[PDB]
Amino acid sequence: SVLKNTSVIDKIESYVKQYKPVKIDASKQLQVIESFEKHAMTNAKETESLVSKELKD
Amino acid sequence: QDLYLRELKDTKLAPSTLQDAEGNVKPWNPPQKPNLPELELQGPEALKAYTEQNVETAHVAKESEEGESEPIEEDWLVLDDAEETKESH
């Protein structure tokens, strides 16, 4: 309202409203991260098996 | 008041063709109808980047890359590299 002879505020506001869905979230990673986790789980379980058997020994 | 009324309508008629009536502009020869509404309308666009910022160019965000689906080579290489450094802790 402070601007009196805008002639362009409507245009930019319409552009912003049309471009409100700028982009969706990128949830692409669903298996490679799972691969890293399964490798880490394997390493952790073999590690703790080794540790437990070593302390018992 | 003669000191008042005549100066009043003089200060009204001189910008009357300038602002109230569409008689271009009498006090100074250069035209104003095609200058501030028309030539200076792009003035903010002339000082700024025309057709580059007033359009507000929206670049779609580039898709964020990742390990590029490498479930064997990356894990094995990481394990081997950690094994190299584990002997020198």
SS3 for chain A, per residue? CCCCCCCCHHHHHHHHHHCCCCCCCCCCCCCHHHHHHHHHHHHHHHHHHHHHHHHHC
Does B79 contact A at CB distance below 8 Å? yes
Q: Is B87 helix (H, G, I), strand (E, B) or coil?
A: coil
Nearest to B64 among A26, A32, A35 (CB): A26
Give backbone dihedrals phi and psi of B35, rounded to 5 degrees, phi first: -115, -60
Chain B residues in contact with A14 (beta carbon < 8 A): none
CA dihedral over A27, A29, A31, A34, signed as positive or negative: negative
How far apart CA A32 and CA B69 sit, in angstroms, is 5
Q: Which tokens in the block code for residue B66?
A: 């990742």
Please tell me the distance in Å from A42's CA to the nearest CA on chain B.
Answer: 11
Give backbone dihedrals phi and psi of A10, rounded to 5 degrees, phi first: -60, -40
What method did the depositors use to determine the structure? cryo-EM
In angstroms, this model's resolution equals 3.5
Neighbours of B50 (CB within 10 A): 12
Does A3 contact B at CB distance below 8 Å? no
Q: Which residue of B has its CA nearest to A20?
A: B58
Q: Which tokens in the block code for residue B5?
A: 């009324």
What is each CA distance from B78 to A32, B49, B73, in whole angstroms?
A: 14, 49, 8
At B32, the amino acid letter reads: Q
Q: Are the C-beta atoms of B54 and B60 separated by less than 8 Å?
A: no
Q: Are the C-beta atoms of B75 and A38 separated by less than 8 Å?
A: no
What is each CA distance from A37 to A8, A41, B82, in whole angstroms?
A: 53, 6, 16
Q: Find, among B45, B80, B78, B12, the residue nearest to A8 by Cα.
A: B45
Q: Are the C-beta atoms of A32 and B67 separated by less than 8 Å?
A: yes
